[PDB]
Amino acid sequence: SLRCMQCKTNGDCRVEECALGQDLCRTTIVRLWEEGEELELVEKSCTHSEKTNRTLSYRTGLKITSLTEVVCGLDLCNQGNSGRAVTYSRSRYLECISCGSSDMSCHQSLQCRSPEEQCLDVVTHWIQRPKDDRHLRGCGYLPGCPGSNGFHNQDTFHFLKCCQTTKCNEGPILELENLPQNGRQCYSCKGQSTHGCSSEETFLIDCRGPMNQCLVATGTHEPKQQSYMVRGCATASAHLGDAFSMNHIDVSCCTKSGCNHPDLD
Amino acid sequence: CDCLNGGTCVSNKYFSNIHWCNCPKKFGGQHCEIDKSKTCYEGNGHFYRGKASTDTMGRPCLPWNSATVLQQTYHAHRSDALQLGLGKHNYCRNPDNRRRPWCYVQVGLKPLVQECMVHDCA
Numbered sequence: 001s002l003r004c005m006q007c008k009t010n011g012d013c014r015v016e017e018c019a020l021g022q023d024l025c026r027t028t029i030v031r032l033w034e035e036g037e038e039l040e041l042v043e044k045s046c047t048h049s050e051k052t053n054r055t056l057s058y059r060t061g062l063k064i065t066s067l068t069e070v071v072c073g074l075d076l077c078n079q080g081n082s083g084r085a086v087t088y089s090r091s092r093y094l095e096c097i098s099c100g101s102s103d104m105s106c107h108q109s110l111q112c113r114s115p116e117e118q119c120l121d122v123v124t125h126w127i128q129r130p131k132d133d134r135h136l137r138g139c140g141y142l143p144g145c146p147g148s149n150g151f152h153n154q155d156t157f158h159f160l161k162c163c164q165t166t167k168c169n170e171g172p173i174l175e176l177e178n179l180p181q182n183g184r185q186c187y188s189c190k191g192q193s194t195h196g197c198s199s200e201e202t203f204l205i206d207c208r209g210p211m212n213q214c215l216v217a218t219g220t221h222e223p224k225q226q227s228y229m230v231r232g233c234a235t236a237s238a239h240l241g242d243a244f245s246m247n248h249i250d251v252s253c254c255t256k257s258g259c260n261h262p263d264l265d
Numbered sequence: 266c267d268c269l270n271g272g273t274c275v276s277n278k279y280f281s282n283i284h285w286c287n288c289p290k291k292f293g294g295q296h297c298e299i300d301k302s303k304t305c306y307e308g309n310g311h312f313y314r315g316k317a318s319t320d321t322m323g324r325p326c327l328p329w330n331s332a333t334v335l336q337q338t339y340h341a342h343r344s345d346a347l348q349l350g351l352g353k354h355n356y357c358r359n360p361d362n363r364r365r366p367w368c369y370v371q372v373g374l375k376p377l378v379q380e381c382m383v384h385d386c387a
């Protein structure tokens with residue numbers, strides 16, 4: 001029955017009554033910061049339970065982008081602004097390497113303003129008008145943290161490395177084709193059940209690097225909210241579905257070649 | 266997305282819907298509408314998108330999203346805002362095709378039209 005605040009990026013809000021299976025209202029914010037000046041975009045609405053509090057900030061030569069998202073689950077808890085949060089001050093803030101595909105920088109350095117923030121490497125390739133960046137490096141806290149996770153199939157490659165050590169996110173830009181043949185083979189598909197993930201539209205892909213599990217995942221995508229399957233190669237990918245903007249999701253992994261056959265469920 | 270002047274639209278999977286714009290080195294604003302380098306207007310200024318924001322008297326302009334400007338005929342919440350160059354700022358514009366770029370100014374208790382100081386590139 002829960003109610004939230006819906007605010008399209010322009011500032012025009014209204015009270016939203018949440019559709020069932022949506023136990024959290026949330027505030028999404030991007031603060032683009034460049035030379036003194038600053039734009040801020042604020043978006044609010046109800047959201048699905050699996051959603052968590054998260055932050056990601058990266059440096060794009062003279063510019064710093066800060067994405068943040070906060071979720072709560074009480075009437076209009078999505079309204080707040082100047083009651084203030086937790087003001088930090090460390091002697092030695094964690095420093096990470098930082099860059100983005102935007103100015104093809106992926107590099108510079110970044111001081112993480114909070115202690116729960118870690119160093120990030122987010123690879124997002126060929127998946128979902130607007131478009132996520134290919135490579136992103138910086139500070140923040142996201143699902144997979146800590147550790148690292150990955151997935152890849154015929155259409156996509158997703159990788160998140162989250163780590164606490166100094167400048168630990170450094171190293172060469174990670175492209176899929178530079179991962180060595182994992183030796184395992186798993187199936188690959190997307191889209192609707194009998195329409196995109198049929199027994200005869202999925203084929204064996206040769207997995208790469210740390211992606212040796214064979215997954216299948218089901219849930220709800222877009223344009224509306226239809227059922228949606230995914231098959232591919234993975235690591236420790238589970239709750240990590242926004243890397244497909246899939247919700248009400250239930251993943252699965254098995255460690256045997258071809259084990260994720262549609263016939264084998 | 267509407268990111269002008271060669272800007273490109275970006276989003277992030279870990280952050281719901283939010284999309285914004287990546288603008289080329291010398292263009293600012295949410296949609297890159299702001300010509301961050303122009304220092305004068307061509308013609309009558311109808312297509313001027315610079316950052317001038319002070320009138321003939323040296324007074325600052327009211328922002329195109331001021332509660333006050335929102336009561337005028339030209340303000341930031343118009344369906345065509347973006348096309349007129351009226352946004353969350355106070356930069357001189359000329360949405361009605363007057364002789365030179367202007368903006369509303371708080372003159373006493375009145376939001377009056379005032380021509381800015383920038384001149385013709387001529």
Ligand SMILES: *[C@@H]1O[C@H](CO)[C@@H](O[C@@H]2O[C@H](CO[C@@H]3O[C@H](CO)[C@@H](O)[C@H](O)[C@@H]3O)[C@@H](O)[C@H](O)[C@H]2NC(C)=O)[C@H](O)[C@H]1NC(C)=O
Pocket residue numbers: 052053070071072073074077078080
């Ligand atoms: C994600 O971030 C949000 C916002 O920082 C967190 O939600 C806040 O949680 C506390 C919970 O403590 C409660 O305080 C209540 C006072 O309103 C009271 O019922 C009782 O003392 C209870 O212990 C709350 O005080 C904040 O006001 C919440 N924020 C808002 C605006 O609702 C949330 O927990 C964070 N992380 C998680 C796990 O979701």
